[PDB]
Design a protein around this ligand. Structure first.
Ligand code: HEM
Ligand SMILES: O=C(CCCCC1CCCCC1)N[C@@H](Cc1ccccc1)C(=O)O
Ligand SMILES: C[C@@H](N)c1ccccc1
Length: 455
């Protein structure tokens, strides 16, 4: 039977917009979802969004015959610097399928064998940093995880060393990319974006886009001018031809792909690693079981690709961290045609949906009563998890191309962390989640006591 959709409290002509006038809009939407349930309508002047929280409805939203990836307003603002890269392109843009066909082989489980040595290079820099801390000192977790994952995708992406472990102040490119992401997300909250109040914001945004284009376009030009054939994503993009069109990517699109990969490495994997370590220090029995696996498997000074594949429990820890705090917390869909969601909610062609991944992952009909508990054992058997219950990498053909890359890096790094150190939650850290494009545990600090195992 056709149901009226719940809607949170309104602010006259501003409708629901002021509810997201916060530095934590995703956590605000999770609290709305807790109050209103599996679906709610969110209205702003000239905009309707429907927020889905239940596996019951999200399993329908994930039907690619009925729904396609939508560019959320957030992604439309990110598109001002990520262009028609894979992340901010519509499925129907020629450059989406072309880049997708060219890059899939670069992102395969098989390509990970090739990236492994460069991931180890950065992972060993992280371990060495922590081995070199003095007795009184602590680790700034998301800070060090962001140094790591930015550097990894720099090196694997285009053989470029951001040298993040040599620095306090980020590489200039990163200061521009972070400020551009911040501007993109802040613009969601401007009820009148064309105010001159926001004129300095507009001008900084253009300068930041230039910094990004200049380093990346110079990186591409330098690579073309050298003729060097390093086994990185830039080489694959310069030489690759789409089997369908027979065309290569042009230099502008390659720039967008590189900016996109840097956004991904900086924002996502670092969040996952930060949440995984958070849950391990809060669940000492789970930390011990993961530490036991790392010690049993990582028998060599340098982990091998094959050894990373054997860190099953560490992979379960990462999936459980993705369940409770999916660092990429939402994706947007549009109805390809008029359709009825869940037998109750009529949608028109073009109607926009937001999938609230943290809420999906807390659906008690799927996960049961222990849903807030950190239990990696939930992930022992992928076949025992219902369809579309677990979506930290999005859905279908528009799912994360980087999923294998991210999980290989996170497994390697967390394996080495658990092999080399005992960890202390010395401050009894109270989770405080900072929102950019992604969720990260802000101010998360630990102490690492070396097990004194040489590299
Ligand atoms: C834990 C780490 C990561 C998470 C949680 C994550 C999550 C996601 C999600 C949820 C999407 C779908 C977005 C949407 O539907 O709007 C996505 C897309 C994408 N991710 Fe990731 N990601 C991660 C790591 C990476 C890495 C390391 C890369 C690249 C090196 C990457 C590249 C991409 C790209 C290119 C897309 C767009 C794919 C397409 O539509 O063709 N991601 N990611
Ligand atoms: O749900 C949100 C706010 C959380 C986005 C989180 C999302 C951003 C991309 C990367 C993954 C996480 N935004 C919607 C609806 C909207 C539109 C305009 C103003 C306010 C809300 C949108 O961007 O379309
Ligand atoms: C590029 C993609 N991995 C992503 C998706 C959602 C948030 C940030 C990044």
């Amino acid at each position: 039977t056709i149901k009226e959709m719940p809607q949170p409290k309104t602010f006259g002509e501003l409708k629901n917009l002021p509810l997201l006038n916060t530095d934590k809009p995703v956590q605000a939407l999770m609290k709305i979802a807790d109050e209103l349930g599996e679906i709610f309508k969110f209205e702003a002047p000239g905009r309707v969004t429907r927020y889905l929280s239940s596996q019951r409805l999200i399993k329908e939203a994930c039907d690619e015959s009925r729904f396609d990836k939508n560019l959320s307003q957030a992604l439309k603002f990110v598109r001002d610097f990520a262009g028609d890269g894979l992340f901010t392109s519509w499925t129907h843009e020629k450059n989406w399928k072309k880049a997708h066909n060219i890059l899939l082989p670069s992102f395969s489980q098989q390509a990970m064998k090739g990236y492994h040595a460069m991931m180890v290079d950065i992972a060993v820099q992280l371990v060495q940093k922590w081995e070199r801390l003095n007795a009184d000192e602590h680790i700034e977790v998301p800070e060090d995880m962001t140094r790591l994952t930015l550097d990894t995708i720099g090196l694997c992406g285009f053989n470029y060393r951001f040298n993040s472990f040599y620095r306090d102040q980020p590489h200039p490119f990163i200061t521009s990319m972070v400020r551009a992401l911040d501007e993109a997300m802040n613009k969601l909250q401007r009820a009148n974006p064309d105010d001159p109040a926001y004129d300095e914001n507009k001008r900084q945004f253009q300068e930041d886009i230039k910094v990004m284009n200049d380093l990346v376009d110079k990186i591409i030009a330098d690579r073309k001018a050298s003729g060097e054939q390093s086994d990185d994503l830039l080489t694959h993009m310069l030489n690759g031809k789409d089997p369908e069109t027979g065309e290569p990517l042009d230099d502008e699109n390659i720039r967008y792909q590189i900016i996109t990969f840097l956004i991904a490495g900086h924002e996502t994997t670092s969040g996952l690693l930060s949440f995984a370590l958070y849950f391990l220090v809060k669940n000492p029995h789970v930390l011990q079981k993961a530490a036991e696996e790392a010690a049993r498997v990582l028998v060599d000074p340098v982990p091998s690709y094959k050894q990373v594949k054997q860190l099953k429990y560490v992979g379960m820890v990462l999936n459980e961290a993705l369940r409770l705090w999916p660092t990429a917390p939402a994706f947007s869909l549009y109805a390809k045609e008029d359709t009825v969601l869940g037998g109750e909610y009529p949608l028109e062609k073009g109607d926009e949906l937001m999938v609230l991944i943290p809420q999906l992952h807390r659906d008690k009909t799927i996960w049961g009563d222990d849903v807030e508990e950190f239990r990696p054992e939930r992930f022992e058997n992928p076949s025992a998890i219902p369809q579309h219950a677990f979506k930290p990498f999005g859905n279908g053909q528009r799912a994360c191309i980087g999923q294998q890359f991210a999980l290989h890096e996170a497994t390697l790094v967390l394996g080495m962390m658990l092999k080399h150190f005992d960890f202390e939650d010395h401050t009894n850290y109270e989770l405080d989640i900072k929102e950019t494009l992604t969720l990260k545990p802000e101010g998360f600090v630990v102490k690492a006591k070396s097990k004194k195992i040489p590299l």
